[PDB]
DNA sequence: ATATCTGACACGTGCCTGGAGACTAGGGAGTAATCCCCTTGGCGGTTAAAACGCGGGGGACAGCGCGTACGTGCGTTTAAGCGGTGCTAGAGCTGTCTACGACCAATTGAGCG
DNA sequence: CGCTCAATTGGTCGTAGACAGCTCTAGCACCGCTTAAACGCACGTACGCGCTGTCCCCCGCGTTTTAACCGCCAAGGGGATTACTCCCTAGTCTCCAGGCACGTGTCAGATAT
């Protein structure tokens, strides 16, 4: 037996692969979990979360801010059609709505 | 300049002493007439 | 008393309308909106209570309503679950 | 907090005739020397208490 | 007692893109909600795929397929590429 | 003039806090719960999760009603624009 | 037979949930002024509407054959517990900076000429 | 037809709240390592119901010229906005008070060391 380290580190991964391996069995999704499946799901969750976290940081950068709030997260969704589709059934607490006007409202 | 290094303590410390005091003093005590 | 759902005030409904981006608002719209607002709770509180009645608790949790909102297709973040 | 003001009105005044105590919340250290007399409406199962 | 959530891990991943940036407690809750919603979507989709195949095993190919029903755009193939990289590097 | 309401749009679209008064909403939530069933009581977080879902739902209804009125060549909403916005959604 | 155990069964205080009272002062409700709107309703350049004569191809066979299904072989798959022990949230507390308040400037909408 | 004026949107100062690195704790399921279950990938082996061109009439289409209708013109008068006037209830924060949970209680009377 040896001094422990995360299985994610050998996979090249940033989230806890061990508890993903727990959740995939303990949630009764199948009788067996393949050795790659929790590594793969951690990689998928990380990839998609990092992709939206750049848009979150960029939404704060656009508003010239340094601390993320739910408004920057709503702006991150409304800056990308993949997120506008994926999160189309999602409510963001205190995120508000994208500011928009139909041209008919405008004077002249 | 140099005073802020102390203010960052003493501005809070005067508030601690005051809050301790105000806690501790509770903690130790028509018509008519005929 | 003000229990006739008129406690959801005219300027509050009008502010929701303004965030919603609508221009001129006819004076029956506030009351038509109060009708929708009741019916939304007749879906959401009712099913949230069916999740409270899964455990048969006295306390409604944020989980109980998030499960009702999930089966009704209007999921919510920040509260978890 | 409540255990103070009721004692502070029973000591140092003649305004009250009588006080109600449980044998176990009242029995320890309160020193109600304004009282002349005591009635045990109940004795405890543990003697000397 | 612990309550199963990703608060420190999403703030660890933020350094991939914006080391300059802080996270409000509210925003931390939103991103904690995001990662577990995508888990409930993928774990359900992969289990329904496994049910249609009657298999005892979930696999890299159940999730590779489930991600393609999660997203229409090429972020699906990039996430699928990242999963196949990670499983390869883990098993080598 | 009759049009500077367009500045209110931009202010309440910049703003992102909840708009209905918490006490009125909590009273209504409790009243609807109590005539539904006995001794149901709500954590503050449940009333907030309800109110956020309600106000997001009504912002969606008003956006949908806006497009119905714009489609009808109006600059005004009448209860009939909401009744289209319900039937066209299947609500 | 005996030591002493597992209820009987209660009031100790902790926690937070949860209610109602008295205050300010935020904001909701009542209203004209008046404009400007949803709406009523004739106008003729433009396409819904349906035959006749007709072009594009829908339709029903016969049977070839690149793939599809069963369901057992056999060696490779994950299961499975339980050793160690690093991660992990609690959580206690800053130590400020960051977004949100308080005072007043560049730029806009309104008035009609 | 482009000014003067009465008001914001946006700018600088302010102040303490709401973060995020500690600063460790110590609870635990992650990671290691054998043990052991049973079926996954392999894979023949039954034999096929998608596609390949014959024979024959069906449906879609172009063309034509009525005549309903949408896009448009302007005006009609009542109801939404802009703004002032005044009344109340949303929020503050307070103390009251009680259900859930934990814990000592204890000694009795039901059970066994």
Swiss-Prot record, chain A:
The modification N6-(beta-hydroxybutyryl)lysine is found at residues 3, 26, 85, 108. GO terms for cellular component: CENP-A containing nucleosome; extracellular exosome; nucleosome; nucleus. Coiled coil: none annotated. There is a cross-link at residues 3, 5 (Glycyl lysine isopeptide (Lys-Gly) (interchain with G-Cter in ubiquitin)). Belongs to the histone H2A family. The modification N6-glutaryllysine is found at residues 85, 108. Keywords: Acetylation, Chromosome, Citrullination, DNA-binding, Hydroxylation, Isopeptide bond, Methylation, Nucleosome core, Nucleus, Phosphoprotein, Ubl conjugation. The modification N6-succinyllysine is found at residue 85. The chain holds residues 12 to 119 of 130 of the full protein. The modification N6-crotonyllysine is found at residues 26, 108. Its main location: nucleus. One of its GO terms (molecular function) is structural constituent of chromatin. Transmembrane segments: none annotated. This is Histone H2A type 1-B/E. The modification N5-methylglutamine is found at residue 94. It is involved in the initiation of both imprinted and random X inactivation. Ubiquitinated H2A is enriched in inactive X chromosome chromatin. Ubiquitination of H2A functions downstream of methylation of 'Lys-27' of histone H3 (H3K27me). H2AK119Ub by RNF2/RING2 can also be induced by ultraviolet and may be involved in DNA repair. Glutamine methylation at Gln-94 (H2AQ104me) by FBL is specifically dedicated to polymerase I. It is present at 35S ribosomal DNA locus and impairs binding of the FACT complex. GO terms for biological process: chromatin organization; heterochromatin formation; negative regulation of cell population proliferation; protein localization to CENP-A containing chromatin. Residues 1-8 have a biased composition (Basic residues). It is found in: Nucleus; Chromosome. The modification N6-(2-hydroxyisobutyryl)lysine is found at residues 26, 64-65, 85, 108.
UniProtKB/Swiss-Prot annotation, chain B:
Residues 6-29 form a coiled coil. It is found in: Nucleus; Nucleus, Nucleolus. Component of the chromatin remodeling INO80 complex; specifically part of a complex module associated with the helicase ATP-binding and the helicase C-terminal domain of INO80. Interacts with RP9. Induces growth and cell cycle arrests at the G1 phase of the cell cycle. Proposed core component of the chromatin remodeling INO80 complex which is involved in transcriptional regulation, DNA replication and probably DNA repair. This is INO80 complex subunit B. The chain holds residues 208 to 275 of 356 of the full protein.
Curated annotation (Swiss-Prot), chain C:
The modification N6-propionyllysine is found at residues 10, 23, 56, 58, 70. The modification N6-succinyllysine is found at residues 10, 56, 58, 70. The modification N6-glutaryllysine is found at residues 10, 38, 56, 58, 70. The modification Phosphothreonine is found at residue 59. Changing residue 70 to E: In TEBIVANED2; results in severe early developmental defects when expressed in zebrafish embryos. Changing residue 10 to R: Abolished ufmylation. The modification Phosphoserine is found at residue 26. Changing residue 16 to P: In TEBIVANED3; results in early developmental defects when expressed in zebrafish embryos. The modification N6-acetyllysine is found at residues 10, 70. GO terms for biological process: chromatin organization; negative regulation of megakaryocyte differentiation; nucleosome assembly; protein localization to CENP-A containing chromatin; telomere organization. There is a cross-link at residues 10, 38, 58, 70 (Glycyl lysine isopeptide (Lys-Gly) (interchain with G-Cter in SUMO2)). The keyword Magnesium does not apply. The modification N6-lactoyllysine is found at residues 10, 56, 70. The modification N6-(beta-hydroxybutyryl)lysine is found at residues 10, 56, 70. The modification N6-butyryllysine is found at residues 10, 23, 56, 58, 70. This is Histone H4. The lineage of its organism: Eukaryota, Metazoa, Chordata, Craniata, Vertebrata.
Swiss-Prot record, chain F:
The modification N6-lactoyllysine is found at residues 14, 37. It comes from the Eukaryota. The modification N6-(beta-hydroxybutyryl)lysine is found at residues 14, 37, 80. The modification N6-(2-hydroxyisobutyryl)lysine is found at residues 14, 22, 37, 80. GO terms for molecular function: cadherin binding; DNA binding; protein heterodimerization activity; structural constituent of chromatin. Its main location: nucleus. One of its GO terms (biological process) is epigenetic regulation of gene expression. The modification N6-crotonyllysine is found at residue 14. Acetylation is generally linked to gene activation. Acetylation at Lys-80 (H3K122ac) by EP300/p300 plays a central role in chromatin structure: localizes at the surface of the histone octamer and stimulates transcription, possibly by promoting nucleosome instability. H3R2me2a is present at the 3' of genes regardless of their transcription state and is enriched on inactive promoters, while it is absent on active promoters. It is found in: Nucleus; Chromosome. The modification N6-succinyllysine is found at residues 14, 37, 80. The modification N6,N6,N6-trimethyllysine is found at residues 14, 37. The modification N6-acetyllysine is found at residues 14, 37, 73, 80. The modification N6,N6-dimethyllysine is found at residue 37. The modification N6-glutaryllysine is found at residues 14, 37, 73, 80. The modification Phosphothreonine is found at residues 38, 65. The modification N6-methyllysine is found at residues 14, 22, 37, 80. The modification Phosphoserine is found at residues 15, 44. Transmembrane segments: none annotated. The nucleosome is a histone octamer containing two molecules each of H2A, H2B, H3 and H4 assembled in one H3-H4 heterotetramer and two H2A-H2B heterodimers. The octamer wraps approximately 147 bp of DNA. Interacts with TONSL; CHAF1A; CHAF1B; MCM2 and DNAJC9. Interacts with NASP; NASP is a histone chaperone that stabilizes and maintains a soluble pool of Histone H3-H4 dimers. This is Histone H3.1. It comes from Homo sapiens. The gene is H3C1. The chain holds residues 44 to 134 of 136 of the full protein.
